[PDB]
Design an enzyme around this catalytic site. Structure first.
Site, PDB file in Angstrom:
ATOM      1  N   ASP B 178       0.832  -1.194   0.000  1.00  0.00           N
ATOM      2  CA  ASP B 178       0.000   0.000   0.000  1.00  0.00           C
ATOM      3  C   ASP B 178       0.872   1.250   0.000  1.00  0.00           C
ATOM      4  O   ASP B 178       1.834   1.353   0.766  1.00  0.00           O
ATOM      5  CB  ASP B 178      -0.924  -0.007   1.220  1.00  0.00           C
ATOM      6  CG  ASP B 178      -1.872   1.180   1.248  1.00  0.00           C
ATOM      7  OD1 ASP B 178      -1.402   2.333   1.136  1.00  0.00           O
ATOM      8  OD2 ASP B 178      -3.093   0.960   1.383  1.00  0.00           O
ATOM      9  N   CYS B 251      -3.898  12.148 -14.364  1.00  0.00           N
ATOM     10  CA  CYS B 251      -4.311  12.114 -15.760  1.00  0.00           C
ATOM     11  C   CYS B 251      -5.578  12.915 -16.021  1.00  0.00           C
ATOM     12  O   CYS B 251      -5.782  13.386 -17.146  1.00  0.00           O
ATOM     13  CB  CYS B 251      -4.542  10.668 -16.195  1.00  0.00           C
ATOM     14  SG  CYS B 251      -5.927   9.900 -15.337  1.00  0.00           S
TER      15      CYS B 251
END
Ligand SMILES: Nc1nc2c(ncn2[C@@H]2O[C@H](COP(=O)(O)OP(=O)(O)NP(=O)(O)O)[C@@H](O)[C@H]2O)c(=O)[nH]1
Ligand SMILES: [Mg+2]
Ligand SMILES: [Mg+2]
Ligand SMILES: [Mg+2]
Ligand SMILES: [Mg+2]
Ligand SMILES: [Mg+2]
Ligand SMILES: [Mg+2]
Ligand SMILES: [Mg+2]
Ligand SMILES: [Mg+2]
Ligand SMILES: [Mg+2]
Ligand SMILES: [Mg+2]
Ligand SMILES: [Mg+2]
Ligand SMILES: [Mg+2]
Ligand SMILES: [Mg+2]
Ligand SMILES: [Mg+2]
Ligand SMILES: [Mg+2]
Ligand SMILES: [Mg+2]
Ligand SMILES: [Mg+2]
Ligand SMILES: [Mg+2]
Ligand SMILES: [Mg+2]
Lengths: 154, 325, 216
Positions: B178, B251
RNA sequence: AAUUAUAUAACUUAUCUAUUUUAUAGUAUAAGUUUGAAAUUUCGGUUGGGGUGACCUCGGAGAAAAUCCUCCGAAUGAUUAUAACCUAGACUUACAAGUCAAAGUAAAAAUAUCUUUGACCCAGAUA
RNA sequence: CCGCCUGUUUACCAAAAACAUCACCUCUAGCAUUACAAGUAUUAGAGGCACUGCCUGCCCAGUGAUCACUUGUUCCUAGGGACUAUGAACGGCUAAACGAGGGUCCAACUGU
RNA sequence: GAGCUACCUAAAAACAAUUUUAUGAAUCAACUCGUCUAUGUGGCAAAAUAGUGAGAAGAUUUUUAGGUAGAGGUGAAAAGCCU
């Protein structure tokens, strides 16, 4: 007078074999479901339809009927079938992707007012880009090439 | 029953139209149109060979032109010509990596310095890792990915491109843990760290139907994205050494996922951990690469890549954060 | 707004959208479909407003039953399409008046407007208030519709004349000293019902009830 | 919805006629192509009432040999020193399928190294 | 409130707001010896839909004016020819009359 | 199997009195229908009785003979009717 215009634009109407004329007319009736009066209107208004082969006229009509959401009356009164498929797809797709055009939904409704079919096709490219889509000429040329590649992949 | 792609476009029109105003149509068409790829050479075996052949294809290295050690070939403005598929070199390494040119901009802006240690918090297949590990001259680069399937892709790319000797040493270290937990594991360890948080993937979301963030079932995750992105950025901010630099990459075009996340991470770090992060100006970046990119400058923090049909190299958002202490 | 003549019904949608902009939407923030609710006291034109908007924007027509009596729409129905481009949807709800009507005058003023079914307030009492208000406002237009000469301030007198004008008679049991006798009489009740109707149509003049007590 | 569809309606090629210098026209039929009047058959399973999303096979991990219990992946590729044939005894197992392997022989002069799945019929490709 | 009206319907639980209906509208057809029809576009068939009057107005290249250029469409190669030649969609209501229709009110009447 | 019922063909029949702008008008019998209530519920009746109601010169009602048949017929569509 209707014969006069037809003869001038399409001199081969008399020469063409029976099969060619019947197929074009039958496509308009069985497949395009045009009324008797409209068949005369389309033949008189755009004589070149007779030259156009079958299964390509049907595609153009279905493109307007389904993709552009037009009706039989709109198609006849605007001489949509007169134009070439390439011009139709280039201008329509550019407007649709720009968000300035939108298919009529099941209800028959459009969230934004669709530009008039005369503005989409009849007008010149410069006016079409400047007024209907408000874009640049360079982008339209690039889009045309990009669209051409997709058709090959299609 | 709208499809996942339909919902993504539907949502974008509601929000991006307000954010971008008159520019949304141009962006809307560009996103729907085919993307533009920028070839990145592998250096290494074909440091010269691939460059010559690509030049014959008329593609020109924009990075080299901008300077006028990363060299990425791209076609001229408005040129639609594609790139031939990459091929295996004589030495056993791939000729070049075909990827979005704007994806390489955050790496170029990270200002890598020789003899450095680098971490990619979430580089699933990203060539960002390949670009970093390529000519970066960064000692002991580390890669971490939440998933394992995408972690497989990263090893594939490294194997094809990176020679065994460089990778064989612990100088490259791949992990599957993680990202938020990683902050506690290695605090103030790495000089330069690149954090590319999971993002709404606007272009792919519209085009790709499968595994689309806008699917109805995944609504819970989609709503939770802003919270998760802040946590990952904060963890990297903890990991970077005093005086280190980190770049936050996204993005999507959302203001929520770009400006609020970075400022939220700064505020959370400033209060809970009592550390001050000062942003670094990137205005000069717009000037350098304006030829091969178009940027929406209004954004208060960061630099945003807007896709236009002329230069379809978007969409990317990247902000540079320097830890003052 | 006027719904029979579709006046000023264009301005509502722009204003309605403007208010939603400034406000928040939370759970429905992502929905592009706008739904709004119409509520009020019965017989105010809530159902008319729906149809009038439907034809001014969607141009389809009547979708909610419209009647000249209070209490025609019974329950909160399903959604009805009203507009297309903004795409607003209207929800129709039954008229709700009040548990308590504050002053009794407040209840008379509503009875004259048709909000209250005249049969649980008394046609005669409503008629007296109508005459009382009509005379004070100077709108003596009920003395020409019905020939009343100098006009009057007694409801029984004016009701007598209008009953004569309309040639209406009842057989009514009157209670006298020697017993009960049925006597033909001018129809005061029918006169009151018709007199209120002409007021509601608007032929008795333009009235603003709140002018006197709450001029502000 | 799947399978059909000389019901009609068109066409094309034959066949059969006439003519025709190869063309036309037609047509007791055959073979196709397009339409579809009709015909035949079906409504997997887990999902309070629904709506919806989902899920159905196998592998890894906790609870610890139960669970609508909690997680990760797979329908893999990479890597190559290319990894034969034959044969005791066992594992696992309803069946089917799936594992390990001495000896002997044969190639060479270290195994492949990482760590999964689909039967039968029926169709392919070859020497 | 609903339906224009007189009509029609679930023999044996629904007579109605449903169906039909004049009126209006759309589509199909240029023709004879068994229906349509011993008829022929003011005809016939298929179907929709209250009529009446009143509104809204999709639409029918542009620019200089029966006229000139740019468009449009085709071709020949970005050049060169050839050719253009009222009314859709809708609504609010004739506005009456009529009803064993569904609600409501007053009068009278009463063993409710 | 259309002696019931649906629709049609041929040949026939019935409609007093009272008013009317002279008629798919009005009032109301015969006649046709079946609104509402009570009774009846193995009943007089496998749908009736008693009241109360609708139309009643018409797209009316009624009689005789013929016709259309189940992959069908007929239907002022109730998926109604065809012993
Ligand atoms: N003069 C006039 N009458 C109006 C107007 N709007 C509605 N009405 C009248 O009011 C009646 C319709 O009211 P309606 O729309 O049913 O109101 P409502 O509040 O929705 N009904 P309810 O009481 O059942 O809740 C009709 O008599 C109609 O003519 C208006 O603007 N002007
Ligand atoms: Mg076995
Ligand atoms: Mg051995
Ligand atoms: Mg009726
Ligand atoms: Mg009747
Ligand atoms: Mg009957
Ligand atoms: Mg019955
Ligand atoms: Mg009745
Ligand atoms: Mg009954
Ligand atoms: Mg009806
Ligand atoms: Mg009735
Ligand atoms: Mg009483
Ligand atoms: Mg008979
Ligand atoms: Mg008589
Ligand atoms: Mg009569
Ligand atoms: Mg009668
Ligand atoms: Mg009568
Ligand atoms: Mg009948
Ligand atoms: Mg029905
Ligand atoms: Mg039914």
């Amino acid at each position: 007078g209707k014969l006069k215009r037809v003869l001038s634009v399409c001199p081969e109407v008399f020469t063409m074999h029976q099969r060619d004329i019947d197929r074009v007319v039958k496509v308009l009736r069985e497949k395009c479901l045009f009324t008797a009066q409209h068949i005369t209107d389309v033949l008189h208004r755009c004589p070149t339809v007779l030259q156009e082969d079958p299964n390509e006229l049907e595609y153009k009509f279905q493109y307007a009927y389904f993709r552009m959401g037009l009706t039989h009356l709109d198609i006849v009164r605007t001489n949509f079938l007169q134009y070439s498929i390439t011009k139709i797809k280039q201008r329509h797709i550019y407007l649709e992707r720009l968000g300035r055009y939108q298919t009529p939904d099941k209800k028959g409704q459009t969230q934004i007012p669709n530009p008039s079919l005369r503005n989409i096709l009849r007008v010149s490219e410069a006016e079409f880009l400047a007024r209907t889509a408000c874009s640049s000429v360079e982008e339209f040329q690039v889009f045309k090439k990009l669209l051409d590649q997709e058709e090959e992949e299609e | 029953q709208f499809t996942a792609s339909r919902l993504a476009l539907q949502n974008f029109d509601m929000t991006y139209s307000v954010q971008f105003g008159d520019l949304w149509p141009s962006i809307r068409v560009s996103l729907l149109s085919e993307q533009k790829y920028g070839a990145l050479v592998n250096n290494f075996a074909a440091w010269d060979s691939v460059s010559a052949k690509l030049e014959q294809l008329s593609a020109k290295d924009f990075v080299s032109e901008a300077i006028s050690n990363l060299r990425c070939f791209t076609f001229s403005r408005g040129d639609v010509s594609r790139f031939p598929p990459a091929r295996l070199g004589s030495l056993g390494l791939m000729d070049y990596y075909l990827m979005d040119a704007a994806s390489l901009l955050p790496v170029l802006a990270l200002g890598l310095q020789h003899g450095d240690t680098v971490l990619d918090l979430c580089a699933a297949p990203g060539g960002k890792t390949l670009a970093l590990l390529q000519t970066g001259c960064c000692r002991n680069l580390a890669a971490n990915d939440l998933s394992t399937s995408r972690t497989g892709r990263l090893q594939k790319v490294l194997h094809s491109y990176v020679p065994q000797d460089i990778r064989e040493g612990n100088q490259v270290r791949v992990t599957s843990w993680d990202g938020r937990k990683w902050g506690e594991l290695e605090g103030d360890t790495y000089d330069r760290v690149l954090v590319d948080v999971p993002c709404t993937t606007d272009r792919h979301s519209l085009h790709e139907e499968e595994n689309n963030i806008f699917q109805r079932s995944r609504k819970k995750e989609r709503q939770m994205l802003p919270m998760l992105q802040v946590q990952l950025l904060a963890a990297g901010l903890l990991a970077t050494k005093p005086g280190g630099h980190v770049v936050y990459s996204t993005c999507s075009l959302s203001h929520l996922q770009n400006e609020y996340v970075v400022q939220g991470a700064i505020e959370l770090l400033a209060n809970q951990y009592n550390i001050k992060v000062q942003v670094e100006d990137l205005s000069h970046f717009r000037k350098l690469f304006m030829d091969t990119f178009c940027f929406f400058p209004s954004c208060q923090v960061g630099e945003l890549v807007i896709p236009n049909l002329m230069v379809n190299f978007g969409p990317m958002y990247f902000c540079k954060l320097h830890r003052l202490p | 707004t006027n719904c029979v003549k579709d006046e000023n019904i264009k301005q509502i949608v722009p204003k309605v959208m403007e208010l939603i902009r400034c406000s928040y939407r939370y759970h429905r923030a992502e929905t592009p479909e706008y739904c709004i609710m119409v509520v009020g006291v019965p017989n105010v034109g809530k159902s008319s407003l729906i149809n009038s908007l439907r034809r001014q924007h969607l141009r389809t027509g009547k979708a909610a039953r419209v009647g000249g009596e209070p209490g025609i729409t019974r329950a909160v129905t399903s959604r009805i399409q009203v507009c297309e481009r903004p795409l607003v949807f209207l929800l129709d709800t039954p008229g709700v008046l009040a548990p308590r009507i504050e002053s009794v005058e407040t209840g008379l003023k509503l009875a004259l407007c048709g909000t209250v079914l005249d049969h649980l307030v008394g046609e005669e009492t409503m008629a007296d208030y109508l005459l009382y208000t009509l005379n004070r406002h100077g709108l003596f237009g009920y003395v020409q519709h019905y020939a009343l000469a100098s006009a009057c301030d007694q409801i029984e007198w004016v009701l007598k004349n209008v009953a004569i004008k309309l040639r209406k008679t009842r057989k009514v049991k009157v209670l006298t000293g020697t017993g009960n006798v049925n006597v033909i009489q001018p129809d005061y009740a029918m006169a009151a019902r018709d007199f209120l109707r002409t007021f509601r149509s608007g032929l008795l003049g333009q009235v603003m009830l709140d002018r006197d007590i709450i001029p502000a």
